[PDB]
Structures are given as C-alpha cells and as structure tokens.
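User: As part of a screening pipeline, I want to sanity-check one entry by hand. Below is the sequence and the SMILES for 2,2'-(propane-1,3-diyl)dipyridine. Please return the complex as structure tokens so I can compare it with the automated output.
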Amino acid sequence: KVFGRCELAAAMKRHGLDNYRGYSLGNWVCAAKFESNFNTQATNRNTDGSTDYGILQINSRWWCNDGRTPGSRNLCNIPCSALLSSDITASVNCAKKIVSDGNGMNAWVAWRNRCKGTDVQAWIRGCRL
Ligand SMILES: c1ccc(CCCc2ccccn2)nc1
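Assistant: Here is the complex for your manual check:
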C-alpha cells in the first residue's frame, strides 16, 4: 500500500504515535516519507547485510527476523515480512520499541538527516486529524 500523506498521519495518530516519547505526529510522517515514500512494501538492503522493511524501514539487524541477517536479533518478535502489510499496526508497535531504545528518533537515519531541525508540522498541514 502506498499511503497518502494525511491517510498515514491519521493511521499513525490512531495507533498512538502523535507525541509518542515526545515526538509530534509530523516527525513520524516526515520519517516515513523519506524512509519509504509512504510505501508499506518498501525494502532496502543495508551495507552490513541486514535489510530495512516497511513504512518506517525497520532493520533486521535488531528488530525483526528475516532469516538471512547473521548475528541479528528480533527484538520486536516479528517476521520482517509482517512489517510490509497494508495494516501498519506491527510497524507502529515495533517503532515504539525502537524509539524507546535510547537515541529517540535518531535511530532513523533519514529522520536525523532530513527531518530533525525542520518544520515537521508542515507534514501534517491540511490534514483532518
Ligand atoms: C538502506 C538504504 C536506503 C534506505 C531508504 C530510506 C532512507 C534510509 C537510508 C539509509 C538508512 C535508512 N534509511 N533504507 C535503507
């Protein structure tokens, strides 16, 4: 599924991401835009051999099991393929763990480089939320 921007903002809000660990909704939307282009089916291989999965590009090195990342953990107790669903529930629950892990949203490379320090509210401007 390729989410519309406001469509995704509403889904994330519904699952309790707006202001989770202090991160306003726009941070999550901006993250998703640059990580996945709002595509639940996005996958991208990392240099280390791990892969990032789904709307928030959750990494098989630590968070999900894809069966081909040696030495990795599966801290969300989920197959990585469950992160590609049209339903974002699994990606959201997993993201809540990630963001609680010590570095906040800096865990998302693209958030730090493209969203952090920007007017992230713009990402939810015009949405009925
Ligand atoms: C690996 C390559 C590309 C991507 C696309 C999204 C932006 C990004 C870049 C780097 C790390 C994490 N996110 N994801 C993983």
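Points to compare against the pipeline: The two ends are 20 Å apart (CA to CA). Helices lie at 5-14, 25-36, 89-99, 109-115.
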